[PDB]
Design an enzyme around this catalytic site. Structure first.
Site, PDB file in Angstrom:
ATOM      1  CD  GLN A   1      -0.966  -0.231   3.781  1.00 38.18           C
ATOM      2  OE1 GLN A   1      -2.165   0.085   3.772  1.00 38.18           O
ATOM      3  NE2 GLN A   1      -0.347  -0.669   4.872  1.00 38.18           N
TER       4      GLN A   1
ATOM      5  CD  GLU B   1      -5.957   2.108   8.169  1.00 39.33           C
ATOM      6  OE1 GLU B   1      -5.539   1.398   9.110  1.00 39.33           O
ATOM      7  OE2 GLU B   1      -5.474   2.054   7.021  1.00 39.33           O
TER       8      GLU B   1
END
EC number: 3.4.23.32
Length: 199
Positions: free
Chosen positions: A53, A129
Site C-alpha cells: 500500500q 482509514e
C-alpha cells in the site's frame, strides 16, 4: 471505541496487478493528534499475510505526510491532486508510486524478495482509514483520534488490473469508518470514482 477503521471500496478476486487512482488532499481539523489517511493497495482483507500500500496522511493541525508500505516522508498541501499506485509483479515483488501532480514531485519504491510476508493478489482497495499508532516495544497500539476533513476525499480514475485485464468497481464491497456506533464516513462508488465524505 473504533468499531471499523476502514472506509472505502474493496474488490476481491485473483491475480491483481496494478491498483491506482488520483485523490485530492483535504483540509483537516480536530487538533494535532487527530488524523486520517487515504491510500490504495493490494491485499490486507481476506489475504492477511501481507499488504502492499501507499498513500498520505492529514493531521488536525494542518500538516501532512506521505508513505508506502509492504516508510514515510514529496511535500503535500491542501487541494493537491495525488496519484497513487501499487503494482504486484509477483507474490513477493512489486512497487509503490506517489505523484503530487500539483507540485510535479514523485517518489517510487521497488520491492523484491519480500520474505517477511507474501501477497496473495486477491484484494484490491481504495481506503480512507483511522490508522493505529503503536509503541512501547510493540504492545500498546491505539487508533489515532479521527480527524474531520473536507471536502470529500475522492479517488478518481480508479484503476484495477488482474491478469492484464481491467476490473470495474461495480462489484466492490463498501465499508465505512465507524466510531462509537456511528458512521464517520460516507464512502460510495460510481463509475471509476470512490468518493468518501467525512460525517
Amino acid at each position: 471505541t473504533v468499531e471499523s477503521n476502514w472506509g472505502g471500496a474493496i474488490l476481491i478476486g485473483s491475480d491483481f496487478d496494478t491498483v491506482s487512482a488520483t485523490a485530492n488532499v483535504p483540509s483537516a481539523s480536530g487538533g494535532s493528534s487527530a488524523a486520517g489517511t487515504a491510500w490504495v493497495g493490494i491485499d490486507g482483507d481476506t489475504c492477511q499475510t501481507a499488504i502492499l500500500q501507499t498513500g498520505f496522511d492529514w493531521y488536525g493541525d494542518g500538516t501532512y505526510d506521505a508513505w508506502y508500505e509492504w516508510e514515510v516522508s514529496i511535500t503535500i498541501s491542501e487541494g493537491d491532486s495525488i496519484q497513487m499506485s501499487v503494482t504486484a509483479t509477483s507474490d513477493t515483488s512489486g512497487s509503490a508510486t506517489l505523484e503530487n501532480l500539483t507540485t510535479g514531485q514523485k517518489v517510487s519504491k521497488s520491492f523484491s524478495n519480500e520474505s517477511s510476508g507474501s501477497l496473495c493478489r486477491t484484494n484490491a482497495e481504495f481506503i480512507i482509514e483511522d490508522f493505529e499508532e503503536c509503541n512501547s516495544n510493540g504492545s500498546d497500539c491505539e487508533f489515532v483520534p479521527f480527524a474531520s476533513f473536507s471536502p470529500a476525499v475522492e479517488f478518481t480514475d480508479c484503476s484495477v488490473t488482474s491478469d492484464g485485464e481491467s476490473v470495474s468497481l461495480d462489484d466492490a464491497q463498501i465499508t465505512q469508518v465507524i466510531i462509537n456506533n456511528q458512521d464517520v464516513t460516507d464512502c460510495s462508488v460510481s463509475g471509476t470514482t470512490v468518493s468518501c465524505s467525512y460525517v
